[PDB]
Design a protein around this nucleic acid. Structure first.
Lengths: 146, 100, 124, 54, 23
RNA sequence: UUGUGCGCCGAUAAUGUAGCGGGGCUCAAGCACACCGCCGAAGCCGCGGCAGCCAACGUGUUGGCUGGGUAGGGGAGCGUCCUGCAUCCGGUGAAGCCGCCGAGUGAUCGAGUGGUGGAGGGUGUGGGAGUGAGAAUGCAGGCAUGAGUAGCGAUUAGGCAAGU
RNA sequence: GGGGAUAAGCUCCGUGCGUCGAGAGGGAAACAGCCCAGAUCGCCGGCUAAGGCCCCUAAGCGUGUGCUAAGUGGAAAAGGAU
RNA sequence: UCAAACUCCGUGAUAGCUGGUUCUCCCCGAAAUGCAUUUAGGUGCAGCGUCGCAUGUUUCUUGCCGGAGGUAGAGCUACUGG
RNA sequence: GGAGGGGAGUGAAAGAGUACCUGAAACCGUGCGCUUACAAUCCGUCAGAGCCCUCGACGUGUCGUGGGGUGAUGGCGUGCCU
């Protein structure tokens, strides 16, 4: 029988990704891989094993092309004519962490488990984070050559 | 110090003393069998070349002949009236791996 | 020779009802509605037994590719190496080696790296 | 209009259990030398004998 | 009009090979 | 100026983005041409079980091809009741009903056993069927959902003290 | 090919053309009739077809040379345009 | 209850019409075409299925050989027209 | 107050008490074990953590060619008949 994680088999570690000057799409897919625990060989779809991912410098993140002014982030309140949109440029100015969060949130499974994964993603606008007591391991986005 | 054994078209990871359920073999209970090997690990080293594997074989004894779980099949297609009932029990042989 | 259909008919009612225990609502009490479930229940199983083989093969690939990238080698190259190197361990045990005893898997990866061609994009 | 569907078991019992009673709050009073429990609303009357205690 | 043109278009998909039932 | 590969404008509806499935992508995750792997089904292969057609020899094994299926045609069976004949069980507890543990390729089985029960049953081989229901706005009986819900049948009106 | 306005998911014909009807499984997001392929049963083995390999989602943010600035890709005409 | 009352009887009236028809497995497996029809949502014969008997590859696929057309195309001081 | 019931008796049996042989299913409770108040569910199916019960071998609890009941979570999934 294939091995399946037991009660206490799961383990966690903390990763901090410098979001400065990283492409939004590229950074998000890297974080969405970490949070789901895809890197571990102990992966199991119905058990979360992802590692807490801290994203710092979340307001410097680079978006290519004209997407800073022509990409809208829509939201509907349910009331008739309640569809209000904010272009990415505005969404970065008011509260910048949202742009990184949504682009990660839409990368994870949408089921109940994907709601549990979100609890393990902390993203901050500034270059500093309060989680220094947990000793995050700095993480960088490379690509295995084939 | 374990080995991966080919039998019945499937490869099982066994060591000394493990008990496995493999497809039926022509060997009465209590008899001993020898099976080929797909890979052997001894401590830290690994034997993977096809030549050395052909030199080694896993010996095992046949515990008994059993049957698998009962499978009930009821094929069906709506608005037609097509029912087909049929059971199945796979015959299984269970081995105790003695030595490699 | 009038025959009362109680004995002959009650036989099939017990089978379905006993086999439909654990269902929620009406599908656990009434023979008519339980039989409607047993048509679906035994159709789902026969479809899921075939799909289980494909599903479990998949879970193994995810564990192999996760450990293969930990040793800096992509999965598709790792398999190309292993096939060329003459190693014929299937995916079930490869995923088993990757999780339980990582020392052997590193040995297997190094075998795959050696047997790979010098320039994998060559038109050979 | 009429109920379109037969309300299931879970939905029937969920609403039915809201149809309950609340037990009265009883205080102890001493009449003629014996202690009997009467609601605090009827406390004053039971001391003057206006309340019949079986 | 919008509905009709969209259905005839999605016949061009790579996996349909340029044909689809009901055009 | 000519021919070409990609583009721009023409562009334009009524619940909510809404003419990429979503996120996102030009640091292509887009397009064209070559090259390299891999994933992918109930397809093909491996190991095992069954059946149909045919062949080889044999006093039923082996081998080869085949086994989606409605209307429909053909073959073989499970279960129920009544009877010929022959046998066996039963107040030291039959039938029926409720379970446990199992069994068969299917209808299904249990002379395997616990509880309730109180008087008839099983098997082999023949005979005959009022012999198998999930549905006909099907029939009779019992009981649900709506639900502790609507109502409690005018246009007069009752109250207090005492009694049983 | 006829009728229609060379319109219809229109209608009537031909086809040792297909499929659905009477057909599961993979792909096309979902989607009888399109593409791959015809389910005797079991397996926690392997190779492929159409289709894919950044995350959801399995396998490539693959290698070489270019092109695109329009999110073209990820709807459209006469025609306009250093 | 009235464009011809009610009850019994003929009577289980008759419907080219709607509905319903109950246990299992194994093998094979269609049609929605033609002709006719007081006929078009019916039916008869033929066509396509299955079972038995008879005949055996006569069936089918490919190559080669002998055939007759009058489409696609094209042509017009070669005809009839434009 | 009665109805009804609890002791005590008859009875082989009161799981035969004139609502009375056997006493099923729908329907209605009571007790116990597991699960459920951030969640889109033709109500199953395939994986599957945890808890509870059971059968063995080995110590205090720990595994197994085990059996049961619940099932957090993931994948797939458009009732039956005409």
């Amino acid at each position: 029988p294939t091995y399946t994680p037991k009660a206490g088999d799961t383990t966690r570690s903390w990763y901090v990704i410098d979001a400065s000057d990283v492409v939004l799409g590229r950074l998000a897919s890297a974080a969405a891989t970490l949070l789901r625990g895809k890197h571990k060989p102990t992966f199991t779809p119905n058990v979360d094993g992802g590692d807490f991912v801290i994203v710092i410098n979340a307001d410097k993140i680079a978006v290519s092309g004209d997407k800073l002014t022509k990409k809208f982030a829509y939201r509907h309140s349910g009331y008739p004519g309640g569809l209000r949109k904010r272009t990415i440029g505005e969404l970065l100015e008011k509260h910048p962490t949202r742009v990184v969060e949504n682009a990660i949130i839409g990368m994870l499974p949408h089921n109940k488990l994907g709601r549990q994964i979100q609890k393990k993603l902390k993203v901050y606008a500034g270059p500093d984070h309060p989680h220094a007591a947990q000793q995050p391991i700095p993480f960088e986005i490379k690509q295995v050559a084939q | 110090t374990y080995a991966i054994v080919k039998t019945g078209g499937k490869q099982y990871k066994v060591a000394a003393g493990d008990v496995v359920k493999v497809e039926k073999l022509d060997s009465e209970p209590g008899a001993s069998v020898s099976l080929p090997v797909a890979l052997v690990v001894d401590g830290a080293n690994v034997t993977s070349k096809a030549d050395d594997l052909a030199k080694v074989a896993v010996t095992a004894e046949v515990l008994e002949h059993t049957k698998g779980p009962k499978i009930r099949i009821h094929k069906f297609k709506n608005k037609t009236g097509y029912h087909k009932r049929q059971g199945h029990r796979q015959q299984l042989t269970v081995l105790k791996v003695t030595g490699i | 020779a009038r025959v009362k259909r109680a004995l002959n008919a009650q036989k099939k009612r017990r089978t379905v009802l006993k086999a439909s225990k654990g269902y929620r609502g009406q599908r656990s009490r009434l023979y008519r509605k339980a039989k409607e479930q047993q048509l679906h229940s035994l159709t789902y199983a026969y479809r899921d037994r075939r799909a289980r083989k494909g599903e479990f093969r998949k879970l193994w690939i995810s564990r192999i590719n996760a450990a293969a990238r930990a040793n800096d080698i992509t999965y598709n190259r790792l398999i190309q190496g292993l096939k060329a190197a003459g190693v014929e361990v299937d995916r079930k045990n490869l995923a088993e080696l990757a999780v339980s005893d990582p020392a052997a898997f590193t040995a297997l990866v190094d075998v795959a790296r050696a047997a790979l061609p010098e320039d994998v994009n060559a038109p050979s | 209009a009429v109920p379109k569907r037969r309300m299931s078991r879970a939905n029937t019992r969920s609403r039915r259990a809201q149809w309950k009673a609340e037990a009265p709050g009883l205080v102890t009073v001493s009449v003629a030398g014996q202690q009997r429990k009467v609601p605090r609303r009827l406390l004053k009357a039971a001391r003057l004998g206006l309340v019949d205690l079986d | 009009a919008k509905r009709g043109r969209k259905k005839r278009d999605r016949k061009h998909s790579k996996a349909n090979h340029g044909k689809r039932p009901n055009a």
